[PDB]
Design a protein around this ligand. Structure first.
Ligand SMILES: Nc1nc2c([nH]c(=O)n2[C@H]2C[C@H](O)[C@@H](COP(=O)(O)O)O2)c(=O)[nH]1
Ligand SMILES: [Mg+2]
Length: 129
């Protein structure tokens, strides 16, 4: 079967703003407004998957932990698990290896349009704030 897991955590900055990968720092993918922690799927545990990938997607030392929301849905012949974790702080700039560098933005205005549309089920909840 076709199934893939994803665990992410919105890093909280020093100004109630979270650092998320958006249009990279100088890339073309402007609709890549996503978060770190992806790839947890690999072969980790529901708990170590994020905690492990966290170091891989942050590399820094941030007071980051707890989950904000987690959901598991499967598309017509596809299985996508998206876990959203809550973060409270992060020292310096987050690097790890998420993919496309981001900037400290206000999560109160998340972009469900810029980020993957099929991945709205998660944002549809928080987006409505
Ligand atoms: N089944 C399913 N998987 C999806 C959808 N959208 C989406 O990004 N995914 C997948 C692809 C990605 O690899 C992953 C999210 O993190 P990455 O883009 O970093 O891999 O989940 C979808 O609509 N259905
Ligand atoms: Mg990763």
């Amino acid at each position: 079967m076709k199934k893939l897991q994803i665990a992410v955590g919105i890093i909280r900055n020093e100004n109630n703003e979270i650092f998320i990968t958006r249009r990279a720092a100088d890339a073309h993918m402007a609709n890549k407004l996503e978060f770190p922690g992806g790839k947890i799927e690999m072969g980790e545990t529901p708990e170590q998957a994020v905690v492990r990938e966290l170091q891989e997607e942050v590399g820094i030392t941030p007071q980051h932990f707890s989950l904000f929301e987690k959901l598991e849905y499967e598309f017509p012949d596809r299985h996508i698990t998206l876990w959203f974790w809550l973060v409270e702080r992060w020292e310096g700039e987050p690097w790890g290896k998420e993919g496309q560098p981001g900037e400290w933005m206000s999560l109160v205005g998340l972009n469900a349009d810029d980020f993957p549309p099929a991945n709205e089920p998660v944002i549809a909840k928080l987006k409505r704030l």
